[PDB]
Each structure stands twice: as structure tokens, then as C-alpha cells.
């Protein structure tokens, strides 16, 4: 005969869903809220185990979502808030030695410390955060609402912070070098905390990112299906030279009582247009990786062209990121331009300081003004590309920078991980009778 | 550099009316203010009108008060003043004056009300006689 | 209103001779006070305002000098090109004042 044994402990787990908290080793993302990250991370190896993965439908990319833009609100809420500012701009063009036409000179009206006086100064803004309202100009925002003034103290360094999951629940990270995304993995382990996860903000680039192990990575919900984003990982990285060499000034206006609003005052030197570097022959091979890798999911003998986005808003038509506490927007159509068969690209850029992170209305942000010329080096570690369809697919099949939403960005992060819940409790038969 | 060139004077009827007319150049004309002096032959100068960067608060002296009437346009870059019950006395040789800042900076009500202000700049003069 | 007298009405000089004009105020306009000088039919030109500071690309034979009510103009050595009608302007209130005006001639 066969009796029922209780095992408490077992190595036993289930999907599930949990609350991980932040680690982490004067920045917008709560450092001194995260508990100190554990110097020696353990990773135990598991063998003869293989585990389900489905990076759409993993939770962590949600959470961290949800994470991210209530650090962002919050991180608005301790300093001056624009809302006064709305009023009339009287505006003109800037030509002191100029070779683009977009930046504006506007002066306007201004409340002081005392509530009895005001003040005539004037500010530089660019043409996207400025429309007219008729000489007569005004903020895009003002008929959406009021901006919240970024704090000038925090800075928008994306520092890397580990999730963890809290006791009783463990990470499961695939170590497969060839993952697909999605289905089963051969080789798992388990993590208490996962790797340095750079929350870079970013559309059409996924930028200082994880580079993968082997050859470069397709990865997409459904490959048939036009209307899901086709995430791509670069196996070697695509340095990119960002900069800024206009080198502002920026001036405290005392828009009240113990509260100042940066402007920019006056740009010393010839101005320039803002643009970003990438290497043609780097490019090269990297796209040229890409379509070998496109041509397995695709099939053979087919040509593949990469053009620039369709179209839509501004944040999703340009390649958007932070540099240096700016907000760039550069126009990346001189990337994917070519078509597939069988010196460095300059890519012109544009700056706006009135932004609406997370595609969100209502809740906009100003960022100010930073001094000096400002540049930057990132990691081209990924992209984010759109196929459309066609009749019978017409042997052709066309490319084009997917301005998707930030999960699909975080997603080529969390997409070796997974929380799983364990149940150490276990019944299992033996022969053995409790003695009474 | 700047300057400022004037027009529209000539001779004129005893009670009737005319205008005058300065063009400013080399300068922000949105942004400093504006003024009128005349000089009558053989006397002094005597400061008749004055007007703000905006067009508003228009203010003469009591000898001119409610027959003259100073007003700009800032999109033409010009100023204007119209003279109405033209007397004898009003010959003079009329000079378009800027003061020498600009209107930036704290006010209470008006820019550049609250700092006090020279006539940097002056136009040539245009002799206007009003005989019969 | 804040009248202002100058004298002396006019003064004939040599070339290189130096030349003082003075003027005063009704009442006191402590500092607020600038100086001009007008050719025969052209415009008016700034020379000292502040009644103390130089006015930029002006020569610098041209001072000021005075505070209060009494003010002063010095020339250090006239110069060819220095005869013309000066005058002296009160801003410290509105409204704005001028001298009855005094030309230099040479002698």
C-alpha cells in the first residue's frame, strides 16, 4: 500500500505576479529609496530543466512602466511649476550668424518677486515648442496645459537599477544565447536581482542597450502580422556621435518668490544645427547583418528595402532620446534608405524643450537650458522597424522606423526574465504510516 | 547706425490740422520709446509729446494737452503725430527724440515707466510754420 | 515744472582754448542730467549723460562735471570741429527740460 507524504520546500514553481523592488549600486530615478544592490548578484545554473518564456506577455515590462512614469511625475513635483508663463510672445526671428531658420527671439511680460510689479525680458525658444496665435506668438501648451519646470539640481542620467523579486518569488533568466523571444528555453537560472537594466528613454533606436551574444536578433510577436513592431538586437554596437555645438546661455528670471525660470539668453558663436554621426561603414554591415537575418524568417531571393517613417507626430517620425539633459530629435531617414538584393552619415537633428513624455496629454514637461556645447557617444544596440504589407507580398518587402510605445524599448532589456512563484508545499506517495 | 528721418511737416492753415511723421532705422523700433521736442525760432527747446514702446500711455505737455496726438505703428517702424487747432506760436522745428535704453527690465505698470530716460537719439528737425 | 537755465547765452573762442559752460536747475535733480550738442542743421548728438559719465566713441576732451542743481560742461581745447550749439537736459522728473541753448563761435 501507498501513503500520502507531505513535503514542505520542494523545488517547485508557478507563474505568477509580484511587486519587484528597485536596487541600485541627484538623478530623476529615486536612488536613495532603492535598497543597496547585493556586490556579489548569485546566479545558480539549473540543468535538466527547461522553462516557457513569452516576452509580450511578461508582467515586468507593465510594472516597470508603471514604475517609471510615477518616478517621473514625482520627480517634477518638488520644484517650480510653469503656469504663469502662459501670456503673450511677442516673437521674431533669430539671424545674428545663422544657417538654419527655426530658433525664435521672444520677449514678453513676467511676474516678479513683489505681486505689485512685472518685468519686460525676453527668452530664445525654438520654432516646435512655439506657435502663432494670430509678430504674435505663444507656447503650444498653453491651450494643453500647464508645464512643470524640470528641476535644474536632478539630472536625467539613465543609471542602471537591478529588480528583484521580494522572498518567496524567484527570476528565471534564460541563458540561452539563440532566444527566440517566446516558448521554451533549455537553459534557465535563477537570480535574485537582474542585471543592469539602463532605463534609456528612447524611439526608432534602442540606445546603450544589451548587445547579443551570437549574431544579431529578430524578435516579434507575430512576423505574419504587420501591425506588431519587429524588435532587432545588434550583436556589435553602432556608435553614434551626438551633439549640440550651439553652446547657449542661460539666464534666471524670477518668474516669482522664491521660484526662477531658466531661459536661454543669447547664443555666443556661429549657430548650428544640431546633428548626430554614425559611421557608413559600421551602418553597413550592421544592415547588412539585419536582412541575413531578415532573409531566415522571410525566406530567400526576396529584396528588402529600408525607407523613413510614414509619418505621424514628431515623436514618432524621429529618432527622440536624451543627450545631455536636452531633448534631441533627429531625423533618421539617411539611416534607413537602400534596398537589399540577392565618411559618416550626418543625421540632422532638432531640439525642443517643451516634451510630453510617455505619449501622455496633459501633464507636459520644459526642460531648461543647459550651458555650454553639449555632446554625447551612445551604443546603437537595437531598432524598432515596422514591415507593411503587400498583394502576395509582391516579392518585396518594406521597412520603416516603428515609433512605438516604451514597453517594446524596455521589453530588449526583461527579455531573458521571468518571476515565478514557488510552492514549496508537496504531496507525493510513499510507504510509510504515521504512528498513532 | 541708427537714425531717424521726418516728413510731413509744411505750412498750415491757423486752426486747422496736420501730421508728422518719423521713421526709425538701425534699431528695435518695438522696444524703446518715443518722443516729440519742437524748438520755436529764436527761445529754447520745449518737450511737447512722449509715447511707450506699446503705443499706450500717451503723455503731453499742458500747452499741447487734447490738440496734439502722438501714436505709433511698430509694424511700419514708424511714429506719427497728428496736430489739430493748429496756433500761431506752434512754429517750430520739430525733432523725433529715442531714449537711450530700451523698455526691458522690472515696471510697474507700463515698461520702462520706472527708469528714467534721455533722448539719446534726435531726427534732424523739419521747420513747421502755421500763418495765413 | 523744473525749469533749467544755461550761461553764458554765447561765447566766442580760439581753436585749442579751453571752453566752460554752466548750467542750472530750479530745483534739485541730483544727478540725472545729459548734454548735447547740435550742429548748424544737423541733428542733435549725446556727449556726457549722467552729468559724469563719458558717452562711448565721443572724444574725451568733452567733461562733466556738477551735482545738485549747478552743472558744468569743459572743453580742453576746442577743436575745428567743435563750434556748434550745446545743450544740457534734466531727466530726473517729468516733464523733460533743455537749456535756452548757447553757440560757440570762433574768435
Known amino acids: 500500500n501507498l501513503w500520502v507524504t507531505v513535503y514542505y520546500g520542494v523545488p517547485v514553481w508557478k507563474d505568477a505576479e509580484t511587486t519587484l523592488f528597485c536596487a541600485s549600486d541627484h538623478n530623476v530615478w529615486a536612488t536613495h529609496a532603492c535598497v543597496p544592490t547585493d556586490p556579489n548578484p548569485q546566479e545558480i545554473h539549473l540543468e535538466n530543466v527547461t522553462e516557457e518564456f513569452n516576452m509580450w506577455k511578461n508582467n515586468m515590462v507593465e510594472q516597470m512602466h508603471t514604475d517609471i512614469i510615477s518616478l517621473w511625475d514625482q520627480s517634477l513635483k518638488p520644484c517650480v511649476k510653469l503656469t504663469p508663463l502662459c501670456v503673450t510672445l511677442q516673437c521674431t526671428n533669430v539671424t545674428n550668424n545663422i544657417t538654419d531658420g527655426e530658433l525664435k527671439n521672444c520677449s514678453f511680460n513676467m511676474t516678479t518677486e513683489l505681486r505689485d510689479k512685472k518685468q519686460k525680458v525676453y527668452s530664445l525658444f525654438y520654432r516646435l515648442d512655439v506657435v502663432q496665435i494670430n509678430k504674435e506668438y505663444r507656447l503650444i501648451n498653453c491651450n494643453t496645459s500647464a508645464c512643470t519646470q524640470a528641476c535644474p539640481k536632478v539630472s536625467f542620467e539613465p543609471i542602471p537599477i537591478h529588480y528583484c523579486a521580494p522572498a518567496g518569488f524567484a527570476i528565471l533568466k534564460c541563458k540561452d544565447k539563440k532566444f527566440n523571444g517566446t516558448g521554451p528555453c533549455p537553459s534557465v537560472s535563477t537570480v535574485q536581482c537582474t542585471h543592469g537594466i539602463k532605463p534609456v528613454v528612447s524611439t526608432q533606436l534602442l540606445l546603450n542597450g544589451s548587445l547579443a551574444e551570437e549574431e544579431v536578433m529578430i524578435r516579434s510577436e507575430n512576423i505574419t502580422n504587420n501591425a506588431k513592431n519587429i524588435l532587432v538586437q545588434f550583436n556589435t554596437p553602432v556608435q553614434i556621435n551626438c551633439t549640440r555645438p550651439n553652446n547657449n546661455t542661460r539666464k534666471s528670471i524670477r518668474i516669482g518668490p522664491g521660484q526662477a525660470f531658466y531661459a536661454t539668453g543669447d547664443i555666443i558663436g556661429d549657430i548650428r544645427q544640431a546633428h548626430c554621426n554614425v559611421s557608413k561603414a559600421t551602418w553597413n554591415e550592421t544592415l547588412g547583418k539585419v536582412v541575413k537575418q531578415l532573409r531566415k524568417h522571410f525566406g530567400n531571393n526576396t529584396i528588402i528595402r529600408f525607407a523613413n517613417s510614414s509619418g505621424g507626430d514628431l515623436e514618432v517620425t524621429t529618432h527622440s532620446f536624451n543627450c545631455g539633459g536636452e531633448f534631441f530629435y533627429c531625423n533618421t531617414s539617411g539611416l534607413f534608405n537602400s534596398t537589399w538584393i540577392s565618411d559618416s552619415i550626418t543625421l540632422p537633428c532638432r531640439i525642443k524643450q517643451i516634451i510630453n513624455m510617455w505619449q501622455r496629454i496633459g501633464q507636459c514637461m520644459y526642460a531648461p537650458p543647459i550651458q555650454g556645447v553639449i555632446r554625447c557617444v551612445s551604443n546603437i544596440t537595437g531598432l524598432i522597424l515596422t514591415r507593411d504589407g503587400g498583394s502576395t507580398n509582391s516579392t518585396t518587402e518594406t521597412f520603416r522606423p516603428g515609433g512605438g510605445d516604451m514597453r517594446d524599448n524596455w521589453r530588449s532589456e526583461l527579455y531573458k526574465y521571468k518571476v515565478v512563484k514557488i510552492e514549496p508545499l508537496g504531496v507525493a506517495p510513499t510507504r510509510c504510516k504515521r504512528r498513532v | 547706425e541708427v537714425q531717424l528721418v521726418e516728413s510731413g511737416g509744411g505750412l498750415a492753415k491757423p486752426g486747422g490740422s496736420l501730421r508728422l511723421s518719423c521713421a526709425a532705422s538701425?534699431?528695435?523700433?518695438?522696444?524703446?520709446?518715443m518722443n516729440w521736442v519742437r524748438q520755436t525760432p529764436g527761445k529754447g527747446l520745449e518737450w511737447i509729446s512722449g509715447?511707450?514702446?506699446?503705443?499706450?500711455?500717451?503723455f503731453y505737455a499742458d500747452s499741447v494737452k487734447g490738440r496734439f496726438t502722438i501714436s505709433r505703428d511698430n509694424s511700419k517702424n514708424t511714429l506719427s503725430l497728428q496736430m489739430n487747432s493748429l496756433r500761431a506760436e506752434d512754429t517750430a522745428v520739430y525733432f523725433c527724440?529715442?531714449?537711450?535704453?530700451?523698455?526691458?527690465?522690472?515696471?510697474?505698470?507700463?515698461?520702462?515707466?520706472?527708469?528714467?530716460?534721455?533722448?539719446?537719439?534726435w531726427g534732424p528737425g523739419v521747420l513747421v510754420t502755421v500763418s495765413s | 515744472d523744473i525749469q533749467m537755465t544755461q550761461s553764458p547765452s554765447s561765447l566766442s573762442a580760439s581753436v585749442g582754448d579751453k571752453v566752460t559752460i554752466t548750467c542750472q536747475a530750479s530745483?534739485?535733480?541730483?544727478?540725472?542730467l545729459a548734454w548735447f550738442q547740435r550742429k548748424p542743421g544737423k541733428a542733435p548728438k549725446s556727449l556726457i549723460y549722467?552729468?559724469?559719465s563719458l558717452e562711448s566713441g565721443v572724444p574725451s576732451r568733452f567733461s562733466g562735471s556738477g551735482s545738485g542743481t549747478d552743472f558744468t560742461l569743459t572743453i580742453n581745447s576746442l577743436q575745428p570741429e567743435d563750434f556748434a550749439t550745446y545743450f544740457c537736459?534734466?531727466?530726473?522728473?517729468?516733464?523733460?527740460?533743455f537749456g535756452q541753448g548757447t553757440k560757440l563761435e570762433i574768435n
Open positions: 549722467k552729468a559724469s
Open positions: 527724440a529715442r531714449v537711450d535704453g530700451d523698455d526691458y527690465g522690472y515696471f510697474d505698470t507700463v515698461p520702462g515707466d520706472s527708469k528714467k530716460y534721455y533722448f539719446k537719439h
Open positions: 537736459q534734466q531727466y530726473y522728473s517729468a516733464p523733460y527740460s
Open positions: 538701425g534699431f528695435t523700433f518695438s522696444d524703446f520709446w
Open positions: 530745483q534739485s535733480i541730483n544727478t540725472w
Open positions: 509715447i511707450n514702446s506699446g503705443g499706450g500711455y500717451t
